Amino acid sequence: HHVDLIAKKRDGYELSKEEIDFIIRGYTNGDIPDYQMSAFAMAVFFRGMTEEETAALTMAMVRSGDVIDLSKIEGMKVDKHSTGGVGDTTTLVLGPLVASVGVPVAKMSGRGLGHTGGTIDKLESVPGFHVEIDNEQFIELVNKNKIAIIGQTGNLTPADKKLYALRDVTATVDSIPLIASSIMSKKIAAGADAIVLDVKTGAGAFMKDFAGAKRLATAMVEIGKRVGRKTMAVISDMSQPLGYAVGNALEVKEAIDTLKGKGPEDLQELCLTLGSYMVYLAEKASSLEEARALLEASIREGKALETFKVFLSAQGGDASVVDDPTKLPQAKYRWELEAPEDGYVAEIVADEVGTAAMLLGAGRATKEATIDLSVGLVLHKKVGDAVKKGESLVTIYSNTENIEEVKQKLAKSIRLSSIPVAKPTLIYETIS
Amino acid sequence: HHVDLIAKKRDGYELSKEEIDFIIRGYTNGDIPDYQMSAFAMAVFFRGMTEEETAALTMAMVRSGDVIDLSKIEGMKVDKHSTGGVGDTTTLVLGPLVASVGVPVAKMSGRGLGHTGGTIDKLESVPGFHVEIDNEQFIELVNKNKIAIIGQTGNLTPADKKLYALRDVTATVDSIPLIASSIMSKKIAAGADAIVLDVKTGAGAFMKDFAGAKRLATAMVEIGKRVGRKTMAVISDMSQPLGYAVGNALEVKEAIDTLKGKGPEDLQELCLTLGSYMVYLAEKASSLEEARALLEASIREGKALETFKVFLSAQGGDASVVDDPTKLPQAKYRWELEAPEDGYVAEIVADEVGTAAMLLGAGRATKEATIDLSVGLVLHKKVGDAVKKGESLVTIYSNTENIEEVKQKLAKSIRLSSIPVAKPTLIYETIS
Ligand SMILES: O=c1ccn([C@@H]2O[C@H](CO)[C@@H](O)[C@H]2O)c(=O)[nH]1
Ligand SMILES: O=c1ccn([C@@H]2O[C@H](CO)[C@@H](O)[C@H]2O)c(=O)[nH]1
Known part of the structure; x- marks a missing residue:
């Protein structure tokens, strides 16, 4: 019974090449149901795989198609x-x-x-x-x-x-x-x-x-x-x-x-x-x-x-x-986000800049969305740079002027220190 | 998304009563598919549950029915x-x-x-x-x-x-x-x-x-x-x-x-x-x-x-x-399995006695099988007992005489030591 393959990995043992090939082939074709594959994947999460196992898994997935x-x-x-x-x-x-x-x-x-x-x-x-x-x-x-x-x-x-x-x-x-x-x-x-x-x-x-x-x-x-x-x-x-x-x-x-x-x-x-x-x-x-x-x-x-x-x-x-x-x-609107104080850029929170760009519409969320290719942002200060109050930290390119949420997210994502910071x-x- | 419930347990955190109730109710009704429940169960296998979690799980399963x-x-x-x-x-x-x-x-x-x-x-x-x-x-x-x-x-x-x-x-x-x-x-x-x-x-x-x-x-x-x-x-x-x-x-x-x-x-x-x-x-x-x-x-x-x-x-x-x-x-046939040598019973391998009884037909294997209630076995020596060569270790009750496999399994399951053994x-x- 296929359960043995799950148990073996759960108990920390190394699957053979034959077993990896078998499980991938059967999952691919439907012989091994999703609930067994997901139990197997969670067992891998906890117990991992050797280098030989990982290479076997790679090639089994390559062989599953063209x-x-x-x-x-x-x-x-x-x-x-x-x-x-x-x-x-x-x-x-x-x-x-x-x-x-x-x-x-x-x-x-x-x-x-x-x-x-x-x-x-x-x-x-x-x-x-x-x-x-x-x-x-x-x-x-x-x-x-x-x-x-x-x-x-x-x-x-x-x-x-x-x-x-x-x-x-x-x-x-x-x-x-x-x-x-x-x-x-x-x-x-x-x-x-x-x-x-x-x-x-x-x-x-x-x-x-x-x-x-x-x-x-x-x-x-x-x-x-x-x-x-x-x-x-x-x-x-x-x-x-x-x-x-x-x-x-x-x-x-x-x-x-x-x-x-x-x-x-x-x-x-x-x-x-x-x-x-x-x-x-x-x-x-x-x-x-x-x-x-x-x-x-x-x-x-x-x-x-x-x-x-x-x-x-x-x-x-x-x-x-x-x-x-x-x-x-070309974007219909450009906005300069000014620095609130003097200082040095100590962090730019990448995930939040990404979210800001997404909010402007620079990315896709449904399988097929149409994207306005003009919008997004251009940072002007990177970590280590000196900044003066009122200087533009980033230019926001948008297709409307309703971008208060983008401004707030970007302002919070750019962190200043009062003393110099290393690159x-x-x-x-x-x-x- | 329900995935969070899996992730939380995977990361070792304690689910709340509300979360246990929710996951059991949704799994029971079909809202939570089997592959998510099985990933959750494997995460529990590795990370366990507190006493409060286990009691909540017990009562959620009680409440699922009458x-x-x-x-x-x-x-x-x-x-x-x-x-x-x-x-x-x-x-x-x-x-x-x-x-x-x-x-x-x-x-x-x-x-x-x-x-x-x-x-x-x-x-x-x-x-x-x-x-x-x-x-x-x-x-x-x-x-x-x-x-x-x-x-x-x-x-x-x-x-x-x-x-x-x-x-x-x-x-x-x-x-x-x-x-x-x-x-x-x-x-x-x-x-x-x-x-x-x-x-x-x-x-x-x-x-x-x-x-x-x-x-x-x-x-x-x-x-x-x-x-x-x-x-x-x-x-x-x-x-x-x-x-x-x-x-x-x-x-x-x-x-x-x-x-x-x-x-x-x-x-x-x-x-x-x-x-x-x-x-x-x-x-x-x-x-x-x-x-x-x-x-x-x-x-x-x-x-x-x-x-x-x-x-x-x-x-x-x-x-x-x-x-x-x-x-x-009453069983149609009785057979005495004789001891092969003098000694003291040191082990009776319980699982194998169970298998022998199953081979005779004492148990059910398909949801509904009809069972011959007459068959099975009666051990005559338990761990610690003295045994003489030729003495009956167990009586086998069967509905046919074709029980060579039962004899062999029972003979191998009763282990003798040459010196006395404690109860x-x-x-x-x-x-x-
Ligand atoms: O299991 C994984 C994890 C990440 N990626 C790649 O890494 C990107 C995310 O970092 C994904 O879009 C994908 O291209 C994969 O292909 N498989
Ligand atoms: O999760 C489990 C494990 C065991 N049992 C009980 O324990 C017996 C096996 O030892 C089963 O037939 C059943 O009655 C359960 O009810 N649930």
């Missing part, structure tokens, strides 16, 4: 995953950036239900840009330009879709082996040969303390070691929002700034770090140092920006947004 | 519950025994799926005895004779029926608060004013170590303290089968022996102990010592036996079985 074939795209396929957070524009920058030095970027994604738009929602800020190409045109564009984007249509990791939904309604999301296997299985099924992970830490991150962030990163790197997909993880800071802009059109404008070498310092450093790992793992550089140098040169010489222009134009977008960002959707560490450590 | 009204039966209603085990004939003896000194025994029970027949299955060994009376005749007989038996028909603790079934298929049976609340809720819903518990310990018991037996007993006594139903628990030994007979007709014959003061010593001592507590709690004696003396006198003077005769006759049975046990169903302790301790 695997995207990228063999006709020349080169190693390296993919990036972040748990993300408020202001994380890295995906918009990293594509053109690494593609400009020869790393093929075969980007597949789907419209999310998150706190901002997904990559597709954001890129659709660009007039004329649309992602409705078939797989052949996708392959062609990647081999020609080294970058393209398509909407995910494959039946990937159906077992993960099902199990993550169940976890979400049974208080079993917060389990390192379940999180690690979910994320990695999705990247492997999408055809990654190698994987770069940005694991966030701090109050704005998925894992709310550094130890947990490190354990998650380690778990995913070990999965990759065992399934033959080299994986490297950077642990980076989300104690405050990244960069300045939170939104859709606003984050595209900031990404354009960053590709020109004049973006926020934190986003620039993060994109250079993640991208150096992507370039090295893709074997388009002989070392991380060489990869970093190539990306700094591509930025300063304008090649990453030209790559972005090629990418936009190839799928219908008006690349002139790079010269004239006013062609992105937090951005890049904590690399796990490989 | 409560039997015994107010027309005069006197305090005291009920007994045992987790039971191989050879436990106490329920057959205790009824007539305590009724003979004025304790009203309003016995309600239903046919079980256990390793022997239930009380009703066993009593139906008596020719003509049937339990098909309505509640009025039941009340009348208890007030006249101080004892009667009826088949449970009330919709009692539907929430417990549902949750125990779920626990059985999710590896969440083995949880002290869940076990304690299940047992006590059933006894409270049946109308007990006071409760005597026989919590077994040892390899033949529900709790497989003494510490756990003691924790379960303590948990149930505390429930009773908080819900206003005085509860006392005896921890007793099931390291070996109780008494000699395992079966149906065979255990009735042994119960008759015990009521005459010539039964097995262990069963006599257990019935005197449990019954003294029942008599005292029913306020039919001023102290446990007086209660014990009254029961010893009732046995030696033949009054408990006459009470059994009244009980049998009042519901159709041929009371002459008390003088002539051959009127109970185990029968009564470990009383919790109140």
